[PDB]
Design a protein around this ligand. Sequence first.
Ligand SMILES: [Fe+3]
Ligand SMILES: [Fe+3]
Ligand SMILES: [Fe+3]
Ligand SMILES: [Fe+3]
Lengths: 209, 209, 209, 209
Amino acid sequence: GTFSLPALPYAYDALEPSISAQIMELHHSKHHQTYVTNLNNALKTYSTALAANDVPSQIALQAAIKFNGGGHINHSLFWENLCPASSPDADPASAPELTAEIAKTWGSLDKFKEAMGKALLGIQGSGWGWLVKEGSGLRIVTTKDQGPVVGGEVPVFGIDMWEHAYYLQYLNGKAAYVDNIWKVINWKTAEQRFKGDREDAFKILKASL
Amino acid sequence: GTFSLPALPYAYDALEPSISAQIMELHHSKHHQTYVTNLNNALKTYSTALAANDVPSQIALQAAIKFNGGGHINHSLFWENLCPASSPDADPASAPELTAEIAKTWGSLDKFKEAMGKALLGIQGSGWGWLVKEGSGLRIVTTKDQGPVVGGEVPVFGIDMWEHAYYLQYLNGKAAYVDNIWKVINWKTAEQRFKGDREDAFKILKASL
Amino acid sequence: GTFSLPALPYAYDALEPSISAQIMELHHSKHHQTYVTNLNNALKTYSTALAANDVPSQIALQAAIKFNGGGHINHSLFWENLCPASSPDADPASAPELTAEIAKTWGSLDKFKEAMGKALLGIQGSGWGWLVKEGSGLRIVTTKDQGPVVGGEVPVFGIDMWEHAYYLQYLNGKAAYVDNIWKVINWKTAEQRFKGDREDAFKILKASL
Amino acid sequence: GTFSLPALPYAYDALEPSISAQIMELHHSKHHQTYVTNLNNALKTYSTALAANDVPSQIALQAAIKFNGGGHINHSLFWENLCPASSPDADPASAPELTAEIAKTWGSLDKFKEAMGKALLGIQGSGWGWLVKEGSGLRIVTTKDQGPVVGGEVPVFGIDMWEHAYYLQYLNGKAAYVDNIWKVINWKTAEQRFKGDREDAFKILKASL
Ligand SMILES: [Fe+3]
Ligand SMILES: [Fe+3]
Ligand SMILES: [Fe+3]
Ligand SMILES: [Fe+3]
């Protein structure tokens, strides 16, 4: 249980005006931090419950590990696939192979953005939207709460649709949040994940879910 | 039939300082309004699938009807069991029979508040906490997203734990939100529901979800 | 990894004409047997992958333990909530408290049967339909493949909608399968589970999923 | 412009003894027919939701369109890459360019058949196995339920592993089903798809899923 909060690749105000400095600070230093802290605590306590043959605690702590582990994975991925709007990495030309495949699948990048926006706005309750790479092709999938993408689904990029991700700035207007987050998507990161050029940093953690 | 947004029993700023006027206005005129409008619209689309005897499309629509129906039910109940902190109705002395049963079940009102607080704070993602009456007894139960309490679980009062219920004022501090909402609980409404003097306004809608 | 195939409470032909003897024999002696055998084998192999610090195999074997563990749990529960159509246990009058609550939730037993039937027919691919008891009331839920009901969802009874559960007798006519399986539902078992009077045989196994 | 069930290229009994006449008739006239009917009806309901600007129903109906559209696509492809065992089209010599690339990728046709069999048998629940062409190369991929291969994953041939594809004849013995289906694979069709001489008849439908 020695997981740590990652440093952001940028300052808390670096994604303005798409995402406010207050949201970024809270989202990282409070929400993500709490997932890390509670993940570590559940993992250590789980080791005690296993040795004690305490089946009720094992079941409860496994659920806590899945929730907080998913929160750690998802937010870690999220920071990496965001960048300042002025960065060259926010230009989809940074992702030639990914955008070529997107066009073959949805017709165009704009048509893909429309489809993913509808999926994001359709999530009931808290959750995430993902572009994932499967052997059978690219696909848009959503997960509830802190469910991570696992198995044969390789995450290309994710967008957080929990209300804490946008409410202070956009209020109930989650559509405006989604419209603006496209400006700060790190297409360089998405390309690297699509091509398989980044090792999976959470391979071990996924084994504990 | 069709559904409408109920007026609040009080002005948008009447629950300050426990709940801000901006939250109340957004929560009512935007969030609850959207559940009502989307419920009506989804029911209309469902009726076309009914006329076409298109059962597969009927099935696909059922989840959206339940989500917006539950949202209408839950928020409708919520407004009724809130009131200004200065009202006599916020005094638990307004609920002699209910508080008597709370005391026999949890030992004291404070011990019940502690148990309810733990349940509310333990919800993962979006959801609601409820005090329900089963037969002559009481129980704390939770629902996920906009799930309503159904069947023999008679709602006495509910507390919304979606982030939109508190984030603008309390940020990530859901514990402070819960601590302060006790000041604006309408115990007179809770007493009337416990005694069975308020009708189940959504009996038919609930049975169809 | 010492799990065993339970004997049926009745002969392979005892559920005719609702479910053929050929289906029951295959479903029990081949399908359920295979889940038991592969569950046991996956549990032992996991110890090798854990001791070997083979994280890739751990992830793969956990998927096999969850899949076969779920298959073992689901089919074990299934046999218990079926019985011969001529038994008094197939009469819903055997479940007064459960059917009373069903009527309070859906309006009537017939309306509940209609709702659960549509849920069963709406499953995409392989899966199960369940009546579950949650603190917030009775609920119809479906699971995909061999996902079991866990957590705050207490299973009251389940119906297998994998094609192997009906195809030899009903072919593509899964609606006819559902219509007829009501005749062999063991409402005595359902009542006992609803009342909390049956032991959970799989507490330990659930800790391994 | 609505969708229609394609006629088979052969009689229902033409693939015996590998696949029985009863399976083919049910698989085509009932299973595939139902996907076509439910696809058309879901699309009509969707157009109603579009005219009503009922976005929640649109999102819900897209899931039904994806399921039934995938079923239509997958089975349409399936019939074309089967043929009578006595046809010259079942001889892999009909596919010189494809088998050359298969041998370069897996070492031999037999080694490819072994790899494909392992993938097919490892599917949990319902799904499909596919040989796809990526760029100039080949890959074995699977889809779950009625998921189609999309984008740059060009289908060369697919094999249905839903239980309705084999159960009446092979019962639980899906391995024997896979062993025997090689005898009725249409390698002429596979060659034409590999070289890009058959157009993608479902490009528009796939872009909307
Ligand atoms: Fe978040
Ligand atoms: Fe709310
Ligand atoms: Fe089964
Ligand atoms: Fe099929």
